[PDB]
C-alpha cells in the first residue's frame, strides 16, 4: 500500500541471581521479519532472518550488534530502576518490552515515528506523535520521563526516526522488493459441516495472503454476526503468508442467508462468498 513500516521489538527479562537479563530483539518490515538478536545465543550478534538481508556486509552487522548491546545495557539498568520504583522484591523476574520504528508514507515522508515501552506487559512510557513530548503511565514513568527530558532523549529519537529510520526502511524495501512490495490476495472458500441433521457449521477460509491485515465477517441477510462468529486470530503459514477463518453455526434452511465478506489489500474488489453446495 502507500504506507510501509519498520519495527524493532525488544524483550528484556530479568532472572535475578541467575545471570544477566535475557535480551531478544527482532526487526520487521511490515509483516516480514528481517533480523534478530538473542543475548543467550552462541555468539550474540544481530543476524539476518530474511534472504534479502544477506547482501549487507559485516560492517552493517557490527554497527547493529553494537547498538542492540548498548540498548541491552540501558534496559538492564532500567529494570533495576523500575524494581526500585515499584518497591518490588529483588528476587522476582520482570519484563521490559520496547517498540520503535517508522511508518514511511507514499511520498517518502515520515507518517509516524514510535518509541514506547511496557513493564510487565503494561504500557509504561511512549514518545508522542510530535517526537518532542512523552506520555507516562504513572509516577514511575513520570520519573523516567524527567530523566529522559534531562538527557534530551526525544531529540535523539526524532533525529533517527526522521532520518536513518526512513533511509534504512527504503533500502530494505528496495533490496527485498519482490517480497515486501507484493500484495498476495487470499485464496478463499467456504466449507460446510453438519452438526446435527438440522444445523451446520459454515467456515469461511482465507489462505496464502500477504500482508497480514484482513477483514473477514459473516453476515446474515446483510447483518453482521460477530457475536455469533468464531473468528480465529490471523496466523502465519510459515512461508511468508497468513491464514484466517471465521465460522458460524446456522440452521440448515437458513444457510443461503449467510455471506462471508473478505477485505484485503491484494483484492481488486471486496469479496462476498456464500456456501456453494
Amino acid at each position: 500500500a502507500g504506507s510501509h513500516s519498520m519495527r524493532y521489538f525488544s524483550t528484556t527479562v530479568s532472572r535475578p541471581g541467575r545471570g544477566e537479563p535475557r535480551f531478544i530483539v527482532v526487526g520487521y518490515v511490515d509483516d516480514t521479519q528481517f533480523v534478530r538478536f538473542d543475548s543467550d545465543a552462541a555468539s550474540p550478534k544481530m543476524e539476518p532472518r530474511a534472504p534479502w538481508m544477506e547482501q549487507e556486509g559485516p560492517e552493517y552487522w557490527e554497527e547493529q550488534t553494537r547498538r542492540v548491546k548498548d540498548a541491552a545495557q540501558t534496559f538492564r539498568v532500567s529494570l533495576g530502576n523500575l524494581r526500585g520504583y515499584y518497591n518490588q522484591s529483588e528476587a522476582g523476574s520482570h519484563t521490559l518490552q520496547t517498540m520503535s520504528g517508522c511508518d514511511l508514507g507514499p511520498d517518502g515522508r515520515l507518517l509516524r515515528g514510535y518509541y514506547q515501552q511496557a513493564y510487565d506487559g503494561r504500557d509504561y512510557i511512549a514518545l508522542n506523535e510530535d517526537l518532542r513530548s512523552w506520555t507516562a503511565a504513572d509516577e514511575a514513568a513520570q520519573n523516567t520521563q524527567r530523566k529522559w527530558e534531562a538527557a534530551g532523549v526525544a531529540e535523539q529519537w526524532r533525529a533517527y526516526l526522521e532520518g536513518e529510520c526512513l533511509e534504512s526502511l527504503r533500502r530494505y524495501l528496495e533490496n527485498g522488493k519482490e517480497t515486501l512490495q507484493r500484495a498476495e490476495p487470499p485464496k478463499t472458500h467456504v466449507t460446510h459441516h453438519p452438526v446435527s441433521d438440522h444445523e451446520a457449521t459454515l467456515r469461511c477460509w482465507a489462505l496464502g495472503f500477504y500482508p497480514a491485515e484482513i477483514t473477514l465477517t459473516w453476515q446474515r441477510d446483510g447483518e453482521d454476526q460477530t457475536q455469533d462468529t468464531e473468528l480465529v486470530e490471523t496466523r502465519p503459514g510459515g512461508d511468508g503468508t497468513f491464514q484466517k477463518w471465521g465460522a458460524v453455526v446456522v440452521p440448515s434452511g437458513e444457510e443461503q442467508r449467510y455471506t462471508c465478506h473478505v477485505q484485503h489489500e491484494g483484492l481488486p474488489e471486496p469479496l462476498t462468498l456464500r456456501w456453494e453446495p
Binding site: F9, T11, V13, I24, V26, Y28, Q33, R36, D38, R49, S93, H94, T95, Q97, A118, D120, G121, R122, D123, T191, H193, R203, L207, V232, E233, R235, P236, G237, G238, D239, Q243, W245
Partner: protein, 100 residues
C-alpha cells in the same frame, strides 16, 4: 505483573493431502509472561526436528511464537501440540483437526 493465557492453533501450512509433504504448525499467541514450553506430538510422542520463530509480540504487548516441523500426513498418524505456561493448570494438549 499481568498474566495472559496462550491461544493455541494447530494446523498445516497447506491443505492436508495424504502422502504429500507439508508443514505442521503450532501457533501460540496472546500470552504473557514470555517463558513457555511447546512440543509437537506425532502419535503422542515428541517430534524431533521442531523449529520455532524468534520471540515477538503484538500491539497489546502479548507474545506469539510459531513452532513448526515438516511432515507428511496419512490416514493413520495423529498429530497434536502441547503447551505449558504459568497461566495453565499444566500442559494443555491440542489435537490437530484437519478442518480448523
Amino acid at each position: 505483573a499481568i498474566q495472559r493465557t496462550p491461544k493455541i492453533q494447530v494446523y498445516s501450512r497447506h491443505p492436508p493431502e495424504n502422502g504429500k509433504p507439508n508443514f505442521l504448525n503450532c501457533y501460540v499467541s496472546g500470552f504473557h509472561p514470555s517463558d513457555i514450553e511447546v512440543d509437537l506430538l506425532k502419535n503422542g510422542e515428541k517430534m524431533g526436528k521442531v523449529e520455532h520463530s524468534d520471540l515477538s509480540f503484538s500491539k497489546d504487548w502479548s507474545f506469539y511464537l510459531l513452532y513448526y516441523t515438516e511432515f507428511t500426513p496419512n490416514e493413520k498418524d495423529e498429530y497434536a501440540c502441547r503447551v505449558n505456561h504459568v497461566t495453565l493448570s499444566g500442559p494443555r494438549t491440542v489435537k490437530w483437526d484437519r478442518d480448523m
